[PDB]
């Protein structure tokens, strides 16, 4: 499956 870039990091 596709792995996308993170655009909003976890806290």
């Amino acid at each position: 499956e596709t792995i996308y870039n993170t655009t909003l990091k976890y806290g």
Partner: antibody, heavy 123, light 109 residues
């Protein structure tokens, strides 16, 4: 075989409350962040809220802040949207959507989407 | 928030014709721009992500291009099932995640 099935929509009076559910199957629900998006009759798409895989990080559209709460029960493969103080303008089909997998946070890719559940705010 | 503007609001074309849809962002979103299709009576479906990458199982007639503030979705030859509404969506700067207002592709006569 990834499937999302919303339920709970119905008629609710202005100022009252309603909880929506989204039942996930065909994937490891606890691994994914989840979104709610809504679509008023004849209108476009409006993002509502997101919750992290583990439930600890939550964000909301300005229009529902202080009124809506997103939550999840990973043991039951279920996503919730608690809607309080409902307004006529909250009338919409509500979709749950899976956040695309990424490392260290949210992707903001919505795939797939459920079939939606209709909320009608009316007296 | 990032405002996405889609033009034209309606595209009137015949099956087999090429369709070009536009999305413009109020500031640069890099390449973080996706396209969803919404067929009548159905939920939206991811078509293109990161401006130009086709989602799984999306036919080759769909393509996208662009970066910064200007993006296009192209359907090289419309099929009957392609007459639908298309939304762009940015994930560069959020919350909120924002969508364009949608472009309807209708049958010309």
């Amino acid at each position: 075989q990834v499937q999302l099935v919303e339920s709970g929509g119905g008629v609710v009076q202005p100022g009252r409350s309603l909880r929506l559910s989204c039942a996930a199957s065909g994937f490891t629900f606890s691994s994914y962040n989840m979104h709610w998006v809504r679509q008023a009759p004849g209108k476009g798409l409006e993002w509502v809220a997101v919750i992290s895989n583990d439930g600890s990080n939550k964000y909301y559209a300005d229009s529902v802040k202080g009124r809506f709460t997103i939550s999840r029960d990973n043991s039951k493969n279920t996503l919730y949207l608690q809607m309080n103080s409902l307004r006529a303008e909250d009338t919409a089909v509500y979709y749950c959507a899976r956040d695309g997998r990424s490392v260290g946070g949210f992707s903001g890719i919505l795939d797939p989407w459920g079939q939606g559940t209709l909320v009608t705010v009316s007296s | 928030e990032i405002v996405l503007t889609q033009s034209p609001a309606t595209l009137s074309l015949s099956p087999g014709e090429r369709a070009t849809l536009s999305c413009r962002a109020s500031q640069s979103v890099g390449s973080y721009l996706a396209w969803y299709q919404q067929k009548p009576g159905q939920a939206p479906r991811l078509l293109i992500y990161d401006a130009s990458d086709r989602a799984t199982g999306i036919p080759a007639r769909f393509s996208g291009s662009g970066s910064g503030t200007d993006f296009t979705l192209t359907i090289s030859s419309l099929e009957p099932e392609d007459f639908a509404v298309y939304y762009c969506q940015q994930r560069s700067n959020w919350p909120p995640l924002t969508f364009g207002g949608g472009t309807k592709v209708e049958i010309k006569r």
